[PDB]
Structure formats: structure tokens, C-alpha cells
PDB file of C-alpha atoms in Angstrom:
ATOM      1  CA  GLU A 448     -73.132 -13.940 -83.191  1.00 21.55           C
ATOM      2  CA  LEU A 449     -76.171 -11.747 -82.489  1.00 18.80           C
ATOM      3  CA  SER A 450     -77.494 -12.054 -86.055  1.00 24.13           C
ATOM      4  CA  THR A 451     -77.637 -15.851 -86.226  1.00 23.02           C
ATOM      5  CA  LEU A 452     -78.880 -16.096 -82.617  1.00 20.82           C
ATOM      6  CA  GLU A 453     -81.704 -13.663 -83.412  1.00 24.46           C
ATOM      7  CA  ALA A 454     -82.484 -15.648 -86.569  1.00 24.62           C
ATOM      8  CA  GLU A 455     -82.783 -18.916 -84.625  1.00 24.13           C
ATOM      9  CA  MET A 456     -84.924 -17.182 -81.992  1.00 23.92           C
ATOM     10  CA  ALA A 457     -87.210 -15.728 -84.683  1.00 26.69           C
ATOM     11  CA  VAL A 458     -87.680 -19.149 -86.302  1.00 26.64           C
ATOM     12  CA  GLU A 459     -88.453 -20.609 -82.860  1.00 28.65           C
ATOM     13  CA  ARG A 460     -91.074 -17.923 -82.131  1.00 29.05           C
ATOM     14  CA  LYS A 461     -92.578 -18.545 -85.576  1.00 30.89           C
ATOM     15  CA  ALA A 462     -92.718 -22.263 -84.740  1.00 31.57           C
ATOM     16  CA  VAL A 463     -94.627 -21.500 -81.531  1.00 29.21           C
ATOM     17  CA  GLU A 464     -97.032 -19.185 -83.381  1.00 24.65           C
ATOM     18  CA  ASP A 465     -97.716 -21.554 -86.300  1.00 23.43           C
ATOM     19  CA  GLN A 466     -98.309 -24.424 -83.862  1.00 27.08           C
ATOM     20  CA  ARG A 467    -100.761 -22.238 -81.936  1.00 25.05           C
ATOM     21  CA  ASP A 468    -102.603 -21.322 -85.137  1.00 28.28           C
ATOM     22  CA  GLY A 469    -102.859 -24.980 -86.142  1.00 28.37           C
ATOM     23  CA  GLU A 470    -104.246 -25.916 -82.720  1.00 30.08           C
ATOM     24  CA  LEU A 471    -106.761 -23.047 -82.756  1.00 27.37           C
ATOM     25  CA  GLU A 472    -107.982 -23.869 -86.265  1.00 27.70           C
ATOM     26  CA  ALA A 473    -108.416 -27.510 -85.231  1.00 34.82           C
ATOM     27  CA  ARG A 474    -110.396 -26.590 -82.115  1.00 33.69           C
ATOM     28  CA  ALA A 475    -112.545 -24.061 -84.008  1.00 33.71           C
ATOM     29  CA  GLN A 476    -113.402 -26.652 -86.659  1.00 35.02           C
ATOM     30  CA  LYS A 477    -114.188 -29.082 -83.831  1.00 38.45           C
ATOM     31  CA  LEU A 478    -116.509 -26.510 -82.235  1.00 38.58           C
ATOM     32  CA  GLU A 479    -118.234 -26.056 -85.597  1.00 35.06           C
ATOM     33  CA  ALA A 480    -118.624 -29.832 -85.930  1.00 34.21           C
ATOM     34  CA  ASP A 481    -120.024 -30.110 -82.387  1.00 34.44           C
ATOM     35  CA  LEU A 482    -122.491 -27.272 -82.936  1.00 36.68           C
ATOM     36  CA  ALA A 483    -123.690 -28.838 -86.188  1.00 34.42           C
ATOM     37  CA  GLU A 484    -124.010 -32.209 -84.423  1.00 36.24           C
ATOM     38  CA  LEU A 485    -126.283 -30.492 -81.913  1.00 38.16           C
ATOM     39  CA  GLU A 486    -128.152 -28.675 -84.704  1.00 38.89           C
ATOM     40  CA  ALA A 487    -129.101 -31.747 -86.736  1.00 37.58           C
ATOM     41  CA  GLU A 488    -129.825 -33.818 -83.614  1.00 39.53           C
ATOM     42  CA  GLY A 489    -132.017 -32.741 -80.705  1.00 40.72           C
ATOM     43  CA  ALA A 490    -130.706 -29.495 -79.221  1.00 44.25           C
ATOM     44  CA  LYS A 491    -132.009 -26.225 -77.801  1.00 44.17           C
ATOM     45  CA  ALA A 492    -130.178 -22.937 -77.274  1.00 44.42           C
ATOM     46  CA  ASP A 493    -129.078 -24.204 -73.835  1.00 42.04           C
ATOM     47  CA  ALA A 494    -126.854 -26.990 -75.176  1.00 40.61           C
ATOM     48  CA  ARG A 495    -125.655 -24.752 -78.015  1.00 38.41           C
ATOM     49  CA  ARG A 496    -124.639 -22.010 -75.580  1.00 37.55           C
ATOM     50  CA  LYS A 497    -122.912 -24.557 -73.320  1.00 37.59           C
ATOM     51  CA  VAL A 498    -120.889 -26.111 -76.148  1.00 38.57           C
ATOM     52  CA  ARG A 499    -119.998 -22.673 -77.525  1.00 39.19           C
ATOM     53  CA  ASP A 500    -118.801 -21.395 -74.149  1.00 40.26           C
ATOM     54  CA  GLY A 501    -116.770 -24.577 -73.677  1.00 35.08           C
ATOM     55  CA  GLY A 502    -115.133 -24.314 -77.086  1.00 36.12           C
ATOM     56  CA  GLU A 503    -114.332 -20.641 -76.584  1.00 39.26           C
ATOM     57  CA  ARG A 504    -112.855 -21.351 -73.144  1.00 41.22           C
ATOM     58  CA  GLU A 505    -110.646 -24.081 -74.614  1.00 40.06           C
ATOM     59  CA  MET A 506    -109.580 -21.700 -77.405  1.00 42.32           C
ATOM     60  CA  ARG A 507    -108.694 -19.068 -74.804  1.00 39.79           C
ATOM     61  CA  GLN A 508    -106.697 -21.780 -73.013  1.00 42.83           C
ATOM     62  CA  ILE A 509    -104.742 -22.708 -76.150  1.00 42.68           C
ATOM     63  CA  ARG A 510    -104.116 -19.077 -77.050  1.00 40.55           C
ATOM     64  CA  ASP A 511    -102.999 -18.131 -73.538  1.00 41.48           C
ATOM     65  CA  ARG A 512    -100.709 -21.147 -73.138  1.00 40.16           C
ATOM     66  CA  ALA A 513     -99.022 -20.383 -76.459  1.00 43.47           C
ATOM     67  CA  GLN A 514     -98.900 -16.723 -75.412  1.00 43.28           C
ATOM     68  CA  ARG A 515     -97.197 -17.555 -72.121  1.00 42.33           C
ATOM     69  CA  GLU A 516     -94.634 -19.575 -74.104  1.00 39.70           C
ATOM     70  CA  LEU A 517     -94.117 -16.641 -76.493  1.00 38.69           C
ATOM     71  CA  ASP A 518     -93.635 -14.229 -73.567  1.00 41.04           C
ATOM     72  CA  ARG A 519     -91.232 -16.752 -72.037  1.00 40.61           C
ATOM     73  CA  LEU A 520     -89.130 -16.669 -75.211  1.00 40.41           C
ATOM     74  CA  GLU A 521     -89.404 -12.872 -75.279  1.00 37.37           C
ATOM     75  CA  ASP A 522     -87.968 -12.485 -71.785  1.00 37.71           C
ATOM     76  CA  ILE A 523     -85.258 -15.061 -72.566  1.00 36.24           C
ATOM     77  CA  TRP A 524     -84.162 -13.087 -75.620  1.00 37.73           C
ATOM     78  CA  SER A 525     -84.378  -9.579 -74.164  1.00 37.31           C
ATOM     79  CA  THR A 526     -82.563 -10.782 -71.038  1.00 37.47           C
ATOM     80  CA  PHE A 527     -79.740 -12.335 -73.065  1.00 40.27           C
ATOM     81  CA  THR A 528     -79.357  -9.260 -75.272  1.00 38.11           C
ATOM     82  CA  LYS A 529     -79.333  -6.813 -72.334  1.00 42.08           C
ATOM     83  CA  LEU A 530     -77.335  -9.156 -70.075  1.00 41.92           C
ATOM     84  CA  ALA A 531     -74.630  -7.548 -67.922  1.00 41.60           C
ATOM     85  CA  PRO A 532     -72.555  -8.370 -64.820  1.00 45.16           C
ATOM     86  CA  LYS A 533     -74.238  -7.684 -61.446  1.00 40.73           C
ATOM     87  CA  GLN A 534     -77.596  -8.622 -63.009  1.00 40.53           C
ATOM     88  CA  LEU A 535     -79.760 -10.910 -60.890  1.00 39.41           C
ATOM     89  CA  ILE A 536     -81.795 -13.700 -62.455  1.00 42.78           C
ATOM     90  CA  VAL A 537     -84.294 -14.647 -59.775  1.00 41.87           C
ATOM     91  CA  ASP A 538     -86.174 -17.372 -61.668  1.00 42.84           C
ATOM     92  CA  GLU A 539     -84.066 -20.542 -61.599  1.00 39.25           C
ATOM     93  CA  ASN A 540     -86.077 -21.774 -64.589  1.00 40.19           C
ATOM     94  CA  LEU A 541     -85.146 -18.759 -66.744  1.00 37.30           C
ATOM     95  CA  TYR A 542     -81.498 -19.126 -65.742  1.00 36.85           C
ATOM     96  CA  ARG A 543     -81.529 -22.776 -66.825  1.00 31.11           C
ATOM     97  CA  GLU A 544     -83.128 -21.751 -70.123  1.00 30.30           C
TER      98      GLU A 544
END
């Protein structure tokens, strides 16, 4: 059953990655909109730098949350494939998964 299990896992990883890319494109377009809103209205390089740092921090947050979920799936899959008796699973959460 390794083939179909690996297929389902690959589709699930792809789902995580495509969701991340949708979120990041949305937030980057929102940062562009916010920066243009500052540009046309009253704004100096202070407010521009603040909004840019905030948008980039949120984009790091999205990327790193999706990356932690991808690494979660990675350890799930490698653990299942290399599973053997006498192996200890310390994380109760990973065992439930």
C-alpha cells in the first residue's frame, strides 16, 4: 500500500504548499495596496518603512506556519515508512496523527 499512501501524502503536501502560496500572494498584494494608499495620501518614508516591515513580518509568519505544517507532514511520513518495533514516539501529538 506504500504507493497509494505516498500518493495521498504527496497530494496533501501539495495542498499545504498551494494554500501557502495563495495566502502569500494575497498578503503581498495587500502590502502593495497599503503602500500605494500611503503613497497617494500623506506619507513619509517612516510610515512606508513601518508598513513594509509589518507586511514582511506577516509574510514570514505565513511562510513559517505553512513550513512547520510541511515539516510536520514530513516527519509523519518518514516515521511511518521507517517504523519498526521498539521505536519510541515521544510526541503524543505525532502518535495520534
